[model samples]
Target chain A: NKWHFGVRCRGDAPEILLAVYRALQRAGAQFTVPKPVNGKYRSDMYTIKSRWEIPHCKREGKNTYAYIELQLYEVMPGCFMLDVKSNGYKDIYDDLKSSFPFLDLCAMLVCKLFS
Target chain B: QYSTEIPAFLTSNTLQELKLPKPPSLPPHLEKCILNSNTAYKEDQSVLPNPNHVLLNHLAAANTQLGVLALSATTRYHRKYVTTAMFKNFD
Candidate 1:
């Protein structure tokens, strides 16, 4: 199964995107370089797409396919769209869910950028 | 948990590439905090807008309808499941 989270906000696009990138890394992700991809279904937008490598996740001793993708792009002038998605086995998915550095990421982003 | 030190800045050269125009030296800061509560009313502007508008509005819808905070350190709903675990068992 897959889980996705996204939001549109008026703020520094790259800076805001920076938070999630680091968050993913903090959450046990090893990522490939994000290249300039149309990145998404929007024009006049800048997008970067990168996939992540998560550690071996297993259920009852069998390996589970775990994956994640991070997408960032500007939707309009001064506005950006954020996307974070992950996939894993149904039961093992729960393990991946809390893998994000949500609590600190939450406080850190709002505190640093919201000023 | 939230304190005076302030959150760290998220940076990327991608935004720098987007517009030769240059957005801001840094992500826009606000006159009132994004999560300000003690003086939330004082900070509110019925007509004039604040920088937090877009993101704050985003958080409301996102955190409420979706699970933006699901993986967060804490939940929107109180921590009822393991509430008593961290506390001392005895007074």
Candidate 2:
């Protein structure tokens, strides 16, 4: 019942993106991780991984806009949640805010909105 | 898997210190509630690693409900602002 939030990614891929994605599904939820840009946490695996998947997820005719999948999970029904994201992603705050359905237990559902 | 301590009314066998008598039969509804509650609490203890926290969460939710009820009761007595002013309800 967790992993209700959605994360948008641009270019950078997380350290263990594939592993985390697989683990999350196996664990019955999604997750977030820091997306280090500017080569701050650069490693061969991250760069190669990012390049391999970034092109496929890029927006049509919007070279400036790329998307990455973030991981979010619900801890309890409409209650607590877990959030993680990458640093290379941005401009999603307004987009996500409009997605709220305005129901009970809304306050407890917070997004980390990592950057 | 958390639980409250047994209420004295539910467990005490002696009547005014007369003697240690056997427990009286509880009504079906109350008995079912208590047994279900106890079984739930015990099972939660084994199933959950942190029984203390889970118990505390239940207690806190119960306490919050009590507070809300108390606030609503008090709000009704506000004759000075009784026009459309009602208690701020939350859940």
Candidate 3:
């Protein structure tokens, strides 16, 4: 099964996106950061996508696939969207709950950036 | 736990990226309001449009939610059964 969630921000400033990136890094999240991709519709705009994985998740001895994708894109000047999608074993959701505080902090950090 | 310090790298860049007047130290009254209350209230709940105020309110709510979750038996149960069920699947 797949689970998806997203957070939206207003403003074109990259600071809010960077703040969330740093927060996830500081939280010791396992993820990959790729180069920012320019928007096709508007050459000046861009998006950043990252994928996080929880490796070695095994039920008994067999491995279970578990990963989450985080995507951030500019919707318009002064507007951004951060989307997250996870696909893997159901058990991983419970484990992910432990990281809620860090996630909440990231959301608040972005608010601070705009505030 | 919700308070995130400015990252060292951004500490310098934020000034240039977000050019504004020097941020003042929080007033004593404002400091007390933040420190002493879990919920911030304006004379009316609909106002206080500043991001700073909103951030404070969010942090307080997050902290409160964490506190409640920490005490919840269902959370504890999930931690326990979820692990054992995974193990069972392995066997």
Candidate 4:
């Protein structure tokens, strides 16, 4: 089954965006904006909407890549959310999820700065 | 009718509130990415209301992963950095 979850966040989007942006780096994951930013939107949103994808989610113990995709969203300026999708791996997927809870996603960068 | 109510959803600790010590500093890569993004690039489309998307294209261009690593660090964060100081620099 596809492992999935969502989070409701209330904070500055830029901070949240970068906090997770960098965390993925710790695990060697990168985020792709996917599409051109909608310079024009009339609602609460992301880069208006930013999604994180692990192009090569290497399995925990093997040298193969796991299937993982995390799509993110926000409601107005106070609410944010994301959905986690994985094809077959649970062990490694769970590990990624641990670091990506709504609690961690957008604040790590703010408080920790960078390495 | 009684008059006693509250707002939609308020009262939660967001991430940034974690409050770790020390100011934010970037590695060389992210530092350089900032310079490149500030200039007009081939990908930067002219947006009338330049907001987050404007920020992302610039940021995603800056400090992403994989081949994205080749790019120096940069984007959305810088604007916040920009806004924190509220300097005339980022405009």
Best by DockQ: 1
Q: For model 4, how does the per-residue alpha-carbon lDDT over A1-102 read when each residue is reduced to its tens digit?
A: 111123234565545544544444454333343132354322222322222222333323534333334334544544454323322223333122222222
Q: Candidate 1 regions off by >4 Å?
A: A1-5, A36-65, A86-115, B1-61, B65-91
Clashing pairs in 4: A16-A106, A46-A49, B29-B73, B30-B73, B59-B75
- Answer with 2 or 3, whichever has the higher DockQ: 3
Q: For candidate 1, lDDT tens digit of each residue in A1-115? A: 1111244457665555555555544544444443323542232122323332323333246433334333454556776545433332232331233423232233333333333
In the range B10-84, model 3's lDDT, one tens digit per residue, is 345543453221212223322122222224565643232222322221111112322221110001133331110
Provide fnat values for all models in the order shown: 0.07, 0.00, 0.01, 0.00
Q: Judge candidate 2 at residue A113 and give its lDDT.
A: 23
The C-alpha stretches of model 2 lying farther than 4 A from their native spots are A1-18, A21-60, A67-115, B1-91
Rank the candidate models, highest DockQ first: 1, 3, 4, 2
At residue A110, what lDDT does model 2 achieve?
A: 16
Candidates in order have lDDT scores of 0.33, 0.22, 0.33, 0.30
Judged by DockQ cut-offs, the docking class of candidate 3 is incorrect
Model 3 residue B33 lDDT? 20
Give the DockQ (C-alpha) for candidate 1: 0.07
Query: How do all the candidates rank in terms of lDDT, highest first?
Result: 1, 3, 4, 2
Residue-by-residue lDDT tens digits, candidate 3, A1-115: 1111235556434465455556555543444433324421221112332333233344354433333344454455566545433332334333443333223333433343333
DockQ of 2: 0.01
Model number with the top TM-score: 1
